[PDB]
Amino acid sequence: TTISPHDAQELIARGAKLIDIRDADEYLREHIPEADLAPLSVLEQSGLPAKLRHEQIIFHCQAGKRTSNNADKLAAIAAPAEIFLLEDGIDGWKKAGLPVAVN
């Protein structure tokens, strides 16, 4: 399931984890302040660490592509949580007028 930036905000206000699956260089250039960084490649190797587990987990990437194309991997990595993909990624978050942190 995809989730709008505004609906994601409401879930984050109730403790949902927002996980940025991009690389550190991308994150450092521009990220969502509420997000926790966990690059997809690291998640594929060693799994989701316990500190990033929650009843609700929202993954995001740049523009929706990496989340859409790895939906089955992400579904397993965060199981058995309720899992969402941020619609249009951080680009979507920006377009909705929600805050980002730029280097």
UniProtKB/Swiss-Prot annotation:
Query: Per UniProt, what does mutating C61D do?
Result: Unable to bind sulfur. Cannot be S-nitrosylated
Please list the residue ranges that the record places on the Cytoplasmic side of the membrane: 1-103
EC class: transferase
This protein's GO cellular component annotations are: plasma membrane
Enzyme Commission number, as recorded: 2.8.1.1
Sequence ranges assigned to domain Rhodanese in this UniProt record: 12-102
Single GO term (MF) = thiosulfate-cyanide sulfurtransferase activity
Annotated localization: Cell inner membrane
**Record membrane topology:** Multi-pass membrane protein
What this protein is reported to do is described as: Transferase that catalyzes the transfer of sulfur from thiosulfate to cyanide to form thiocyanate. May have a role in the detoxification of cyanide to the less toxic thiocyanate. May also be involved, directly or indirectly, in the transport of the thiocyanate produced across the membrane from the cytoplasm to the periplasm.
**Quaternary form?**
Homodimer.
Q: What protein does this entry describe?
A: Thiosulfate sulfurtransferase YgaP
